[PDB]
């Protein structure tokens, strides 16, 4: 029920719908500008990125990292927890089917109250556009106002 702004590159800039995850209150409230990274392994973030020696920590003076993550195989909350542990500043979950947006919900059966990073589900189309812009060498910048 919210949106987001891809600010770069020109080929895909614009305002896109998205569905904010229904878990965690972001610690540093306000507006967040990031650079989008699509991981080369563990793209569904159901296992820890440490096992892969993969980190999304940004170097001093560079944009915080927004990790693009594919839907599948594990709970949304676990993906947010795993990506948070790898140091992403936010998580975008590309939907697996082309369909209207759904709201990522919490499960029940805990780390849940320890999830802090902004989370959102985007459409498969925007997910595919971002990946193709990145594949072609353009960094994909993005701003979140939630």
């Amino acid at each position: 029920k919210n949106n987001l702004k891809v600010t770069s590159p020109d080929s895909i800039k614009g305002i896109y719908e998205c569905a904010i995850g229904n878990f965690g209150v972001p610690q540093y409230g306000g507006t967040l500008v990031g650079t989008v990274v699509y991981p080369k392994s563990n793209q569904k973030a159901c296992k820890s990125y440490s096992d892969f020696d993969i980190s999304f920590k940004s170097k001093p003076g560079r944009l915080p990292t927004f990790v693009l993550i594919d839907r599948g195989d594990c709970y949304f909350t676990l993906k947010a927890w795993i990506a948070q542990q790898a140091g992403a500043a936010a998580i975008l979950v590309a939907d697996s089917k082309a369909e209207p947006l759904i709201t990522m919900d919490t499960p029940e059966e805990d780390y849940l109250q320890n999830i802090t990073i902004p989370s959102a589900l985007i459409t498969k189309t925007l997910g595919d556009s971002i990946k193709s812009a990145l594949s072609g060498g353009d960094m994909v910048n993005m701003k979140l106002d939630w």
């Binding site: 599948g72 949304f76 909350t77 759904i102 709201t103 919490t106």
Partner: peptide, 5 residues
């Protein structure tokens, strides 16, 4: 809708 996964 909503979902957990």
């Amino acid at each position: 809708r909503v979902a957990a996964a």
